[PDB]
């Protein structure tokens, strides 16, 4: 509906987890680690914006500690937020910073923007 996900160009078969303010890390990570424990899952994406941007990064960082050897790409972006105003109705849009992070078991092009190699155990 909303198009293909982030990283459809690099890893279309990756599971995409949207991280929101309401999301619970230990629960979100439980699913992510279980997913990535399987051999059929080669990669995963975490994305979020605004009040969940920091949490999105934390989720990625936790998985890199639970599974060493993952290749990473981080992509920066903006996402819209609707504000209704009547102060000195009226729908007004503004951009909020965000990001999407790909983590994969398989090698990624190391020269592309946002690439980060696996950490040494």
């Amino acid at each position: 509906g909303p198009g293909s996900g982030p990283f459809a160009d690099l890893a279309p078969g990756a599971v995409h987890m949207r991280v929101k303010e309401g999301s619970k890390i230990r629960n979100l990570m439980a699913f992510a680690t279980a997913s990535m424990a399987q051999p059929a899952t080669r990669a995963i994406v975490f994305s979020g914006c605004g009040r969940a941007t920091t949490k999105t990064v934390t989720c990625a960082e936790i998985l890199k500690r639970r599974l060493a050897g993952l290749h990473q790409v981080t992509r920066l972006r903006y996402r819209s937020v609707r504000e209704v105003w009547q102060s000195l109705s009226l729908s007004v849009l503004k951009n909020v910073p965000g990001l999407a992070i790909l983590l994969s078991k398989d090698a990624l092009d190391p020269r592309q923007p946002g690439y980060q190699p696996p950490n040494p155990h």
Partner: protein, 105 residues
């Protein structure tokens, strides 16, 4: 462990955005002593600000700046009571964004 070049800026989330952008921009413009690149670091809740600074520098550059991000986890240490000693230890997510001059298109 983290780098502390004149290139490396750990952005304060509390300051005015417009002025902060203008300081970063001045680093890239010079007076000369222009930086061909800077590194913008955001810790914890300052991650969105680092991103916003980088993307706005990119947008106002007429195709002459590009940005690229990496992430890490940073350990912050501080004392609560002197020495036996009681030390607070916090792990924070962080973003590290290279902002660099390129040849447009």
């Amino acid at each position: 462990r983290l780098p502390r070049r004149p290139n490396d800026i750990y952005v304060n989330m509390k300051t005015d955005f417009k002025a902060q952008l203008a300081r970063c921009q001045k680093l890239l413009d010079g007076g000369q002593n222009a930086c061909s690149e800077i590194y913008i670091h955001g810790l914890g809740l300052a991650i969105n600000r680092a991103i916003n600074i980088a993307l706005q520098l990119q947008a106002g550059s007429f195709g002459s700046l590009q940005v690229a991000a990496n992430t890490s986890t940073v350990e912050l240490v501080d004392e609560l009571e002197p020495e036996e000693p009681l030390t607070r230890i916090r792990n924070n997510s962080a973003i590290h964004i290279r902002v660099f001059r390129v040849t447009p298109k």
